[PDB]
Ligand binder design. Structure first.
Ligand SMILES: Cc1cc2nc3c(=O)[nH]c(=O)nc-3n(C[C@H](O)[C@H](O)[C@H](O)COP(=O)(O)OP(=O)(O)OC[C@@H]3O[C@@H](n4cnc5c(N)ncnc54)[C@H](O)[C@@H]3O)c2cc1C
Ligand SMILES: Cc1cc2nc3c(=O)[nH]c(=O)nc-3n(C[C@H](O)[C@H](O)[C@H](O)COP(=O)(O)OP(=O)(O)OC[C@@H]3O[C@@H](n4cnc5c(N)ncnc54)[C@H](O)[C@@H]3O)c2cc1C
Ligand code: PRO
Ligand code: PRO
Lengths: 468, 468
């Protein structure tokens, strides 16, 4: 292994106290930036939570809930009475006065809950919905749903669907290019049967030609093509496929190759070192999507079943936040080698990146990204003209495309993300949680914990090492 | 009285069978137009009701509500189970498994329900919220809340507030003119103490100088100034004030004077004849807002208490719809004399006007109008580029401005409008009412009734003549 590859391998499951301790100073926002990040986060979160005055309206209630000392069911009864009285037109009059059931229930609940996250059933239908937000400065990346191909036929169907999508998106793009125009994202698990346990030689012989073919096609249309990151035990093979791809003669001089890295992995900073080296050696700018990570629940369960030395991911959410900030700094440092794409729905994460990116923004410096159905509310404050009170930073929406038959795995990941009490999108709905706690700085949070617990970066109390 | 004024007076309370019979053929859409109106209405209503697939989602439910023959509380219990099961991260595991209380209650319920209809507490705050929709082709008219001045001081305060608003809107308009730029609306009841019973000589001596002053000021900024229509027994005096205003030398050649007429009045078509004559004599194009009418409940109660020969308004909602269509045709016929502004939230009314207005639309031919908090959803399909799937017709939003202390009377009118089972905005929420019934043609509805009941335009069965 190369120096940078060896360093990745060695960091696979290193102890959390150690990993978190190393990240801390790399993630720390310089005091001035910290404060600007705080103010911007607070404001973003305020406008988002209180768009329709959901807090000021709670305040008006409690103001009467005390002046009369009434209960919940009490105050409501009064409002109904007041409503009925307001429907009196004249003021004077008002004044004077088996298993299939279960199998189907799950299918239906998935489809009902899933609609909000799907852009369209077909690529043409998704493209049709693009202009509305593209006219406002948003960009799109299309995500053909369907993964973990089980058969050769499965993988073939996915391959054909991706090709068709690229032709369609590429015709829609119409020369707009990899930054300003739409792109596509692909899952390697979709292109090779039984990817989860696939061996190196079969992946190269079979998966790679498909990856190359799609990438050449994307390049012909000059659209971005991004490789999604999946389970942690596929990181290594994904790097081998990326390595090989970046040295294809037909791809020389083209900067449309994109790759996701997951901040919840202890390996993330080390993967960045490798990528910086790869960009240098292959003479290109890589489009790098920095994400926190979508498979956390399964990663913990997987590690606990394999009874290994440790976890490949962090066990406290705040450590993932710290990792993301440290990694973001590393990416922003090398604008000649990387085009960073900062995927987040978290107002603080967004504000911190906005500040870390420094003065003198230019369009091709970086972009934000979000998931359809989750990020638009927040990024409506961000993408757009400064005169209209926006930040004038581009956001690319990831737009799932497919029918109910391909929706399951993606939906479950969205359920987990939205429903977790640690998630920003969950906590911002909790009007009992003060904005300041919601946008609290992750580094300072970690230092608080370290003081209270006796050392930095201890694992989650409820998540012991697999061997315990 | 002039011929046209005499004809108004004589129509004040004419029998509904007679009034409705006269309107019917004036309102009838020529067969071809009728069908295009139907298709457009249907489509507008479909997109509005089913924006987030609220009907297709009901269809998916009932499809299982039968395949298992489960009740409402039953199906829900299943969805919760299916939701909990979808939160299992791994598929294998999932598979294997006193009076102040009342006085305050009314105040609070008003403010809570009222927020959705108010644009801002102050004119500057309302103006600040303009760009978002003005950038999309919407226009605004600002409605300083507060009416029925009881004292001389009250009316003075309203006068001062209107003046300040005109300066602010006029500075915001910045030369955009009466069609493309924002304007203001005023209530005469706000400018004169105890307007409801005010005598002709005192109104002219006191109200008129204030009306003139505001209109001259509006003209200096070249912004529209619209006179709201209020209770029916103030129609006559409002016409006298308008008559006088239109002959002011300082207003000669200026077409920014606006005036509301209420289609639910039997007098409406006759008022149009008068207005057409007034525009001719005073040598101007009048901005005429055709509305159905906001005071129906009070009008019925007022007439029943005065025990007069009949009602000044129709007693069936469908007759008001017919009156509006007939009046709309009359207005569209005289583009040199009137700039018609068609206020409606009703998809059929809108579609019918769109068709009646004929081929070869030009911006200054007419506009649509709506109330803030009620019309934007519908007009998002209407105002905008044809390429984006819109109708490319302008809509002017009426935007209430003021604090909770001025909100009461307006809110009650909105409660009545929204809550009435006869209102389009109520029925469109009723997913059990088929789109075709919702957008049913009013003339054909009236003819159906006439066949079933034995004659055309009979009063509402539940609303006898006041003397019964
Ligand atoms: C355009 C786009 C593309 C994406 N592509 C991928 C992809 O290819 N692969 C993928 O894995 N994800 C991908 N993601 C999504 C992603 O990783 C999640 O949306 C994300 O982790 C949420 O981060 P957040 O800052 O919005 O929310 P935040 O609420 O700030 O953080 C949320 C989360 O932190 C983590 N976490 C939660 N609990 C813990 C814990 N106890 N210990 C340690 N970490 C914890 C998680 O990673 C998690 O989702 C993509 C997202 C977008 C917007
Ligand atoms: C910009 C703007 C300015 C306005 N200015 C005024 C104004 O100065 N004065 C004013 O009075 N209104 C005014 N209105 C509002 C108005 O009159 C109501 O919003 C309106 O009547 C609703 O009509 P619609 O076509 O949207 O709804 P629809 O549901 O199609 O019709 C609604 C209604 O029909 C009528 N109605 C209801 N029941 C009956 C019945 N049993 N018999 C006969 N008629 C019935 C009513 O007039 C009523 O509101 C204005 C509205 C707007 C948008
Ligand atoms: O599949 C997922 O969950 C993430 C989110 C978009 C694609 N990668
Ligand atoms: O006051 C009302 O109710 C109507 C609606 C806007 C102004 N005239």
């Amino acid at each position: 292994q190369s120096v940078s590859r060896a360093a990745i391998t060695a960091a696979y499951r290193r102890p959390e106290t150690e990993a978190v301790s190393m990240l801390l100073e790399q993630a720390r926002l310089p005091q001035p930036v910290a404060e600007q990040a705080h103010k911007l986060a607070y404001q973003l979160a305020d406008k988002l939570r209180n768009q329709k005055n959901a807090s000021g309206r709670a305040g008006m209630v409690q103001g009467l809930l005390q002046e009369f000392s009434l209960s919940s069911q009490e105050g409501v009864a009064l409002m109904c009475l007041a409503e009925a009285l307001l429907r009196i037109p004249d003021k004077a009059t008002r004044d004077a006065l088996g298993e299939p059931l279960i199998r189907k229930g799950v299918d239906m609940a998935m489809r009902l809950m899933g609609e909000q996250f799907v852009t369209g059933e077909t690529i043409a239908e998704a493209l049709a919905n693009a202009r509305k937000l593209e006219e406002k400065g948003f960009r799109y990346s299309y995500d053909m749903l369907g993964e973990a191909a089980l058969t050769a036929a499965d993988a073939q169907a996915y391959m054909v669907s991706y090709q068709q999508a690229i032709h369609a998106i590429g015709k829609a793009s119409n020369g707009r290019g990899i930054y300003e125009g739409p792109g596509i994202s692909i899952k390697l698990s979709a292109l090779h049967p039984r990817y989860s346990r696939a061996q190196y030689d079969r992946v190269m012989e079979e998966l790679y030609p498909r990856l190359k073919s799609l990438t050449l096609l994307a390049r012909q249309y000059d659209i971005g093509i991004n490789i999604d990151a999946e389970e942690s035990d596929r990181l290594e093979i994904s790097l081998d496929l990326l390595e090989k791809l970046c040295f294809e003669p037909e791809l020389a001089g083209w900067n449309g190759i994109g790759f996701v890295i997951q901040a919840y992995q202890k390996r993330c900073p080390l993967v960045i070192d490798y990528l910086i080296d790869l960009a240098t050696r292959s003479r290109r700018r890589l489009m790098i999507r920095l994400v926190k990570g979508a498979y956390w629940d399964s990663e913990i369960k997987r590690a606990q079943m394999d009874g290994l030395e440790g976890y490949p991911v962090y066990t406290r959410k705040v450590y993932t936040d710290v990792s993301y900030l440290a990694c973001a700094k590393k990416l922003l440092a090398v604008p000649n080698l990387i085009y960073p794409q900062f995927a987040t729905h978290n107002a603080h994460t967004l504000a911190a990146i906005y500040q870390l990116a420094g003065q003198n923004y230019y369009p091709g410096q970086y972009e934000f990204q979000c998931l359809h159905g989750m990020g638009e509310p927040l990024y409506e404050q961000v993408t757009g003209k400064v005169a209209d009170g926006k930040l004038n930073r581009p956001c690319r929406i990831s737009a799932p495309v497919g029918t109910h038959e391909t929706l399951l795995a993606y939906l479950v990941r969205r359920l987990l993300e939205n429903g977790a009490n640690t998630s920003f999108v969950n906590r911002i709905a909790d009007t009992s949680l003060p904005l300041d706690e919601l946008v609290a700085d992750p580094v300072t949070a970690v230092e608080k914990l370290a003081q209270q617990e006796g050392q930095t970066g201890l694992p989650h109390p409820k998540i012991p090492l697999p061997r315990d």
